[PDB]
Amino acid sequence: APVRSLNCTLRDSQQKSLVMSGPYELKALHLQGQDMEQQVVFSMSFVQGEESNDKIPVALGLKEKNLYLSCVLKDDKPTLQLESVDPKNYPKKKMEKRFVYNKIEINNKLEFESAQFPNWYISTSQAENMPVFLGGTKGGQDITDFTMQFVSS
């Protein structure tokens, strides 16, 4: 397909699942059992960009929803946000830079670095029920690695 994609869920290294907070926000919390179905399912698209054997550019949209994770400057600081897009023009092989992430395979974990803002990563807090955000520090208090689970689509 023009732009190839696959459906998946992500869990941070502390086994927290991701769920929709408001219409434009994601939160992370320890979920289990029935509640597991509340978790967000992503449509990860493999877009154009500088590629490596361990660094692959991707776009992260919500499955069946014209909403994509985007990195933009908000108050002079890199910020993560869910952005609405024209449902007929997305996804596409050549996504605007703010939608692109460098999927990095480390341990057996994944890290998502903003293509727009070097060394800024999708991160979660140690705390329960806090927003998913863009962090500029690795190996610290905040969590920056995840594992991915494939879903039947």
Phi-psi region of 110 (alpha: psi -120 to 50; beta: other; left: phi over 0): beta
Closest CA to 58 of 50, 69, 74, 47: 47
Please tell me the distance from the alpha carbon of residue 34 to that of residue 57, in angstroms, as a whole number: 33
- The rounded radius of gyration (Å) of the Cα atoms in the chain is 14
Method: X-ray
Please tell me the distance from the alpha carbon of residue 109 to that of residue 9, in angstroms, as a whole number: 13
Please tell me the distance from the alpha carbon of residue 133 to that of residue 25, in angstroms, as a whole number: 9
All structural domains of the chain: 1-153 (2.80.10.50)
Taking the chain, what is the end-to-end CA distance rounded to the nearest angstrom? 15
- H/E element, 69: strand 67-73
Inter-residue contact 110 to 104 (CB < 8 Å): yes
Residue that the structure tokens 């449902």 belong to: 87
